[PDB]
Amino acid sequence: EKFRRYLSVFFRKHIT
């Protein structure tokens, strides 16, 4: 499985 592609850009809601 692999679901580390969505948060890779959603986690940007902090510094950038």
> Is the alpha carbon torsion for 7, 10, 11, 16 positive or negative?
positive
**Rounded Cα–Cα distance for residues 5 and 11 (Å):** 10
Tokens 């510094």 sit at which residue? 15
**Rounded Cα–Cα distance for residues 12 and 1 (Å):** 23
Distances (CA, A) of 9 to 1, 3, 12, 13: 18, 12, 5, 8
> Which DSSP symbol is given to 3?
-
10: helix, strand or coil = helix
Contacts of 8 (CB under 8 A, 6+ apart): none
**Rounded Cα–Cα distance for residues 1 and 16 (Å):** 27
**Rounded Cα–Cα distance for residues 3 and 16 (Å):** 21
